[PDB]
Symmetry: D2
Amino acid sequence: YNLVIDHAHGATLVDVDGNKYIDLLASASAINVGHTHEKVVKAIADQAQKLIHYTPAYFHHVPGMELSEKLAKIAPGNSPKMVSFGNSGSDANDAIIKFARAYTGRQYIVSYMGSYHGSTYGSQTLSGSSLNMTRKIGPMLPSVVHVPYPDSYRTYPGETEHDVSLRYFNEFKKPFESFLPADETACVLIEPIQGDGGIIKAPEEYMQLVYKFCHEHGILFAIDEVNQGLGRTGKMWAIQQFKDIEPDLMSVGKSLASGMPLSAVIGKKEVMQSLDAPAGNPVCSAASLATLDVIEYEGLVEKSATDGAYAKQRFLEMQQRHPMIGDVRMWGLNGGIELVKDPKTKEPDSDAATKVIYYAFAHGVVIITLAGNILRFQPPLVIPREQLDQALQVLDDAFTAVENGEVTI
Amino acid sequence: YNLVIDHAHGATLVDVDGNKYIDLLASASAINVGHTHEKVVKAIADQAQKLIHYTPAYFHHVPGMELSEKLAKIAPGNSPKMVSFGNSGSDANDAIIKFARAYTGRQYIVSYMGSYHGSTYGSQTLSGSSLNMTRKIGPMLPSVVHVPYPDSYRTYPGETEHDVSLRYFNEFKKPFESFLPADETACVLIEPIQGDGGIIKAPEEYMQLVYKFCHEHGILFAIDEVNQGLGRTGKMWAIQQFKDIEPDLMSVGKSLASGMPLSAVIGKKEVMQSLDTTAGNPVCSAASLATLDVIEYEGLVEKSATDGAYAKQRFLEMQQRHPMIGDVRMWGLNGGIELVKDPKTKEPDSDAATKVIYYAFAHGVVIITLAGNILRFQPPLVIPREQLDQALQVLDDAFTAVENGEVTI
Amino acid sequence: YNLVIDHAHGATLVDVDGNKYIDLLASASAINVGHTHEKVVKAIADQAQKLIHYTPAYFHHVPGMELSEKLAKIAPGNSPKMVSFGNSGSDANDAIIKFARAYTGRQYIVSYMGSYHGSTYGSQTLSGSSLNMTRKIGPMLPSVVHVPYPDSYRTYPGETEHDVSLRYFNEFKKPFESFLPADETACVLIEPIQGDGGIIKAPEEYMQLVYKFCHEHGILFAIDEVNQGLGRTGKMWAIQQFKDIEPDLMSVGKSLASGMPLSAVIGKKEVMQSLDAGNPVCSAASLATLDVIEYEGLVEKSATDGAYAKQRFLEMQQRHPMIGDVRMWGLNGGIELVKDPKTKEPDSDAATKVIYYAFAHGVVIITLAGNILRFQPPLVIPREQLDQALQVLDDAFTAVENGEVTI
Amino acid sequence: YNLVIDHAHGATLVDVDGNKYIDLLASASAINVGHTHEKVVKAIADQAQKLIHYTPAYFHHVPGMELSEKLAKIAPGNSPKMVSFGNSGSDANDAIIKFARAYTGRQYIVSYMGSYHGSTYGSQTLSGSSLNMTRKIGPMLPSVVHVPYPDSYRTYPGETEHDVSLRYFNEFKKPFESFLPADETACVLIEPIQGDGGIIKAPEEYMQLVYKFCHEHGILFAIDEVNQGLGRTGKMWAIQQFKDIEPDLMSVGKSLASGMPLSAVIGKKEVMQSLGNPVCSAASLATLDVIEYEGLVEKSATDGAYAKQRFLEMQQRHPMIGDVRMWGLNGGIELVKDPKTKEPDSDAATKVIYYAFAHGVVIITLAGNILRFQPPLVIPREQLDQALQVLDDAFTAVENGEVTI
């Protein structure tokens, strides 16, 4: 924005002029635990003194070593895990293909519509989000198939939620009853809940079906936790929001260390040993350890859930007074609050979603839209309930603003 | 390396037992400035006080603005440039492919055998050092073609450095005169002096031939300077070892940030204009600024040259007593010590190198090998002479022991 | 049955032991005109006298030249065509991808599920029915996206031809809305009716929705008349079962020369010159087979014979219920067998029994996707045979309803 | 060219006006048996009355079977074989990619620069012929690598045969000693003598040394003789000009059915196992007998060595003929601006081709400075001498400089 950024602590952002802003984008999930958090600043700085950089290849450092343990330990499920480290969720998704393809000796990758696994040649190929248009830069990474994601808002007449999971599971089956063998596809990468596609969840009835087909045909079941991890959902991992799921392979990046360039691939021991190198960094390891501690100490996973239920209840009543709110998809501090021209037609109102970004930003609170009309509500999980209401307030006048036909551009 | 590192500073590494070593490796030249340099340590620690992360698209930031100017000034050439961020050497090289293809509307990439470019599907594919970067993970990025790089030691009886360039240039042109059309190759991509090849420099004549070729046929000329720039070589960058060449694109990762995971694409203003996650990081740019400071303040480039030159003559003297050091190729504090059985046959001595490197470790110097038998000598540029004299002395005796066979596994 | 065929004529495979069979075969279109039609034979025989082969990339020759012009006028639309000569269906469909990639400047190709466009590395990618065919041969041609063909049988609880087209065109756009760029998409290949996947036709709305999307976004609109052309559907071309749709590209094989290895790519003048660029005998066979379809009026014959046979194939369904669905457009149908018309679950068991019952009673008939018996006799077929083949199949429905048919 | 044809017999061609020409192009060597040989015409005649085409994807027929036991035996090597049929030499190598990939389980195919494997996306990635190249139709089929072919004419001053074999093999490995996992390469497909590349034979040592390598790694060693087969070369297959090499997979085409669309993949049984036209098959049935009975393997060897000699004496006077390659009635005759720089002289190649055709011999250029001497193998000595004089004159009517474009 025209006036550029200075410092920030928890939820308050401060730019060059001293202007105060309430945060809700939280850097596409990273700011899980606020900005400049004292234990994580202390850990950064105290580590930078000891050793800035050495690589997991040739030498061990301690914190990355202490980190690895804590990440196999915290990981979803009980099977013996192992972590590989990366720089970004972007490069950890690449790895998930490398691993998948190695263990299974297989080529094809089934990734999703609506999804955004990243920005390197492999993770850019796996994605398919609105803005995320890989124009001019093809050909992409070969042997990748896409499959639709269970849309819940936009449906045929009289579909139950049981029906969605049947109709989208049918769509998912469709290439495997055609051109894609099953004994050839090495991996299904799924967002348990989609980020960029508009804070969309898949029904459990669906994921289980997908988590069976994967298990029945030997195709690795990988989950992308870069955006929806570390309490964001109200449980510690988005995958846990479903009953009994043990991902073969999982990615996390971004959030892991309050925005320091770190990432992990957490999967099964036998999967993690089909390559062996060269087919980690200390300060962000130290930061990771510091954020992990904060997640556990401040009851943050719970704060994610308790504030998460509350905010749902605030967007529900607020939808009642402003019929433009077409859907509200909250699971944790984790909203998908999407605007529509009419509630019958459910047509996007990207016009109305951008105006609300303008009112928000101009009246002391920062938020953004995903694919056009859905506002992504992903605030830092240490937002004092106070600050949150002042966000909700402004988000509310802004609704009425655009309703009464107030702010222009 | 059978170890855990406690702490480090400059060109010394301290293990947890308390032992010290000269870091002759410099951790794949991520450390030209050394470990934990004061100005970097206070760059990291002060900026973490203020901002840990926010991507340069919602609010932009103070050092994310500064380094993004300060990077473009200092590139090789006169011509307007913009610079895009990332984290790794790898992920910047993905971006090269991208910027190249986009600009041109073309499809193919040309890369060299024996170069490492990274471990993301893009960069991973262009490489040609170790075979594990394909194995079990195919297919690789489409439309990529590996040519040979010039070797100036393993020559056919009596080739003058002209014959090397012209024979390798001829072996260069062959894909274009067979299956590959010059009008769909977006870019050559080439490390000015290879790393994992064996610190191997292409002749001037080879470079201008390839360079003109690129401009004649609309192919962009790209350089990987991850290993070889930032004072490494003798001049600030490795291209300035050649008469007026100007990169269309250029990458650096690694030593951009005294070890931190930040990285830069530097394209010619035109190439960059088509498009533009932990990338840009405020702590990291802070770190990176400080280390350019030091390259200037501490005279690191002019020093790199002189210490480099000195380090070359002691090996040239060390070659003379010792029959085994086949090639000593070196530019700045940056050389390769390819040991061989006999100096006529020119046949790899993988054994003698390991023997050299092991003994060195159990004598207070950490050096490592490449392509079997080549001693990778790329220390921190800040190295004090006394230590530079000490590593040098240790390695001299290493040579003496092997010739006696006084070394064993 | 390791069935060794010695000689043939019209709609009569006769083997080596002296047996007589009623063809209605398949493995894609092949026998539109008929077996060893005196017209065709004579032309090959006498063309053989003159010329075996001299590749047109050197000298030119008369039959090729007549059949370049012949096909260029007689292929649907107004726009000047030019026509490029492949050896088989495969190397016409491989060339659509060339032809579209060269003209548009765009890499991506959009093709259908349950389709089959050819067996070489280009077209095999495009295809999508035979899982067999795409095992242990990766990687295939890069940039190719698959979109589900319209299924008018297995609907959702009482939906309309209008509901289907939307639902199926939504899916068609899902790619374009996520990861595929419409402006980097060279073309969509589409069989106007899927051959090797159960004789299945897009509703009218779906074709105009796609065609309209194609043209607006700069994507060429490809048709495949490999299986479905040459008066099979009852019009000269399957695309002419739809309204004012002139292809940008069009592939034909098989019966182009009654069987003699010939295929054509027939697009627009401009499109066909994008690249920097046909057997004498095969072309004389073809040039005859083209006169036959006009002369014996086999386009007109199919339509009538076909609808007649539709009502015939449909009262069979109200006595014998196992037939879920009767699909027929001209002498071009696919009779589809199920457990129960509420479950619609394939009963491929019953089907391979009818093919065996019928193989024992002088009538060869091979199956699609297990349960779907494909129905593609040679169009020359006389009514006494058609009925002598149609009565049999009915007798079979009786027999497989009994468990009289065992293996 | 701008010319329409009407009839041809054996060696001789005739356009619709009546100007008689002589074949040397020979339909890119699809006409080995000669044009409209009676046994072949009588074969298509007979069988087209019997069956045009019924679909092979299902049940069987007799001409195919007879051919598929015939070919199967006349293959090179003593190991058991199985054949697979296509419509063209292009789709046949498309199978060679496929088959290799099923058997081995590996992706990477390795093909040679200057290679002509054909024109579908499979054998057009394999291919490496410049004037046959694949602009605006990329992306091409992944995991195809192009190692360079031994050119035994452009050498660096004073290299033995052995040297070229050492060096091009040292090029061969450079992929594998760097980015290409040898244990993940499905097959090396090679033309033994490169057709469209310029009539270029691989040295004895180099072929062995690849066969060796390939054998050492489970890399299926493959051969395309779409061009160079059926006795074009003086031996039956062109491979038998080498020492005890058994192909894992071979590709036959073109002159299989005297030009009628017919292809073949002749493989070791073991390789084909675990993964066609009734008229054209009959056509090949006869064309094989004509090769056999009219005794052509040997005629090609005999006329081939007469053709070689005369040409080497043509070079003694005309120093524009910089290289004379020849193996059977099969040769490249490379035109150069200079006996010592060896610069391609296209310009002249153009005019040579212009003269010759003006005087009733057909002949064309390979990479625009190599004349593709490849007549039908039943060209009588008479005609063969008529061309050799009409070519002889051409070189001198360009030495004097008369021919115009």
